[PDB]
Symmetry: D2
Subunit: 141 residues, 4 copies
């Protein structure tokens, strides 16, 4: 809640800006390390998590359309928030593109992203970058 | 848009009630074949799809908390809408439970759901049911 | 399950795999789209002693999409379970990973699902499947049309 | 890649697999959590002639979680790619499917990711990994503690 609301950064400096509402809503924007690269997001989170050391389940969606570009696709992230001095949101994502029926087999990509509250540097932003980046962001996005 | 807004039914009679807004918002509820089993959903969809026979990309999230139960989990569906006389929404989903760090390996289930606009019968609602149902709905939900 | 799994399996698009289930848990065979150019080696594992409570039989297999004719520089894994009976079926989830550059790693893996039965589908069935959007885990480029 | 893949690989929690890459594309070996009771047969496939453009080497493998000691009635597949070099690495996505009843089929398959390198992690590294939430694709019940 207090912990989820705010700005989050992935492995590559992509930026997730989110407000967690009292009622379980997630609202915000997803962008790159640029208004051309900013997209609306919305989701849900468990607003009354267990108090046993478990993470807080959540998920959200970005449709990759804004006033500048349309990639005809949408990503959903499913994951959990873990608070603390090194707070993280660990996720798995699915990126589905609109396709014809014949191409439906290649409609959905899968991956994983970890978000933290401190912006990374180009060192760990490029090394880790050579480690295999995992944006669920289509290039056009 | 006109085509996505409305009530959708999965393989097992689970019910997805959604409004597609002009701006790309999805808002609605997810429920069983019961207010105890109704949960808020929110998502995004491509409000300006290609006109080449491709589907419309979309996704949405349910956090499995309502005023009756809390499963401490959230499902995201990623998929595409295909319109027509047998309109469908084909999806893949991820169900992540809040877990401790040690149990994070079993935090996320994966599956697939197809939604159509006509409510199925118990025949095809139980056969197809013996065919292996795929709700992304945790039991407590 | 050794006897129940061994044999030819079809998806609803007609893709075919031929597998031998070994007593030791091995799965060995081929996956094909009809012709040799579309046929690939498969190998995997299955639970050779599953629970005796009505549960399915966990299994998985891999196909690397290289044979003596073509190479799609990719590989698919299928993870799922066998259910025996007069309508025996293998329900799976698959992952198709392509070799890519580092920059393209994030878009290296497709995910999908597919179901196999022992009954060859008719063109009819094959036509409605295609209609319900194709679910195969083979890349089209593995297919010699 | 036959030479680069053959050998022992570790995840950041210390799980280990030992694989031989055959010239023909086969992957053969074992997966273990230290002791025999936690060791399982693996088999898979890899692209034995990958692209010559900087791309990785597509591969996959399966482990059914049955050995001579225990049986978890499940199987995992890993799909991913090998990247060679002084910091050689195998990046994967995995699917862990348990045999279940029909009613529980919807919750039969876990998904996750894991990365392997040729360097055994220290307890330190192992401790921060555990901290960053465990990513292994083996069920705990496959592990003899």
């Amino acid at each position: 809640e207090a912990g989820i609301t705010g700005t989050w950064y992935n492995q590559l400096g992509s930026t997730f800006i989110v407000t967690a509402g009292a009622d379980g809503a997630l609202t915000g924007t997803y962008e790159s390390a640029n208004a051309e690269s900013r997209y609306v997001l919305t989701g849900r989170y468990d607003s009354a998590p267990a108090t046993d050391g478990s993470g807080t389940a959540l998920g959200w969606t970005v449709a990759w359309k804004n006033n500048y570009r349309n990639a005809h696709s949408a990503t959903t992230w499913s994951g959990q928030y873990v608070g603390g001095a090194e707070a993280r949101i660990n996720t798995q994502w699915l990126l589905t593109s609109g396709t014809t029926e014949a191409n439906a087999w290649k409609s959905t990509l899968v991956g994983h992203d970890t978000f933290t509250k401190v912006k990374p540097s180009a060192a760990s932003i490029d090394a880790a970058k050579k480690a295999g980046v995992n944006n669920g962001n289509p290039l056009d996005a």
